[PDB]
Design a protein around this ligand. Sequence first.
Ligand SMILES: CSC[C@H]1O[C@@H](n2cnc3c(N)ncnc32)[C@H](O)[C@@H]1O
Ligand code: SF4
Ligand code: SF4
Length: 273
Amino acid sequence: PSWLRISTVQRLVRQYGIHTICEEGRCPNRGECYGQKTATFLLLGPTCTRACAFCQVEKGHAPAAVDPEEPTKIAAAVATLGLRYVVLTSVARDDLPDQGAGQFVATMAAIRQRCPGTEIEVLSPDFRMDRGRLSQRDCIAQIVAAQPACYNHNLETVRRLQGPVRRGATYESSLRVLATVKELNPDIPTKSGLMLGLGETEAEIIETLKDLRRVGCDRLTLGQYLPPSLSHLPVVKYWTPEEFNTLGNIARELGFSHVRSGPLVRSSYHAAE
Ligand SMILES: CSC[C@H]1O[C@@H](n2cnc3c(N)ncnc32)[C@H](O)[C@@H]1O
Ligand code: SF4
Ligand code: SF4
């Protein structure tokens, strides 16, 4: 498809022994982003045990050990890069009693102590593997209590494609994450993104936007699914820039703000707005 086509961050992240979901998945947007003094740090990895077929994070049989210095190392990187807006995400940690929620909270505290004024957005997993543990709701509540600038949780695809696309997450559980944020503190903006091109139809995309608005999702991103080289999950369709633009407008008309819609968009792209 024709329309689909420096190292100072790269140096520091490599130097502090930390990880960005960014400089891992070779994100077409860095430098626009880097240029804007943002980046997305990946906590609790670098490997994930879940099986999402679209995701380029290295898979592993065992969870990586939790680094108690990861929060402070991220804060140091933020301070040294002079980042103004930071996104924190993580791999799913179904093995941990709090499913990793504490690591977000610690990292946010470390950043605020060292870099006052830097705004922090969270892209969380679903925390749904709750059985006999701290509840999904309380994992979310721990993070919401730290007052992120935005709480992002991606629905990724429409209802029909949840199984093959995100074997291990669900439509309802991910909707619930977004609903829960607004129940706990309606003043925290919420965000969700979808990847297009996996076989979903425009009718289904609209239904999914309506479902997001029903749980009060303030912000939307739409981008194109790009299959990882050895992924068994095929791309079905390349959505055109015009199609993304008309969907972007539809989203705005349904009440989303900070809408970002385009082939190379990801939920962290231009998050600072
Ligand atoms: C912003 S970094 C994480 C998000 O980027 C998006 N993303 C991950 N992998 C891909 C991919 N192969 N193609 C398009 N978007 C992706 C997914 O929505 C994910 O939650
Ligand atoms: S859980 Fe999040 S990090 Fe792990 S595979 Fe799925 S998308 Fe990647
Ligand atoms: S889009 Fe998100 S993930 Fe890609 S570069 Fe910008 S911050 Fe990193």
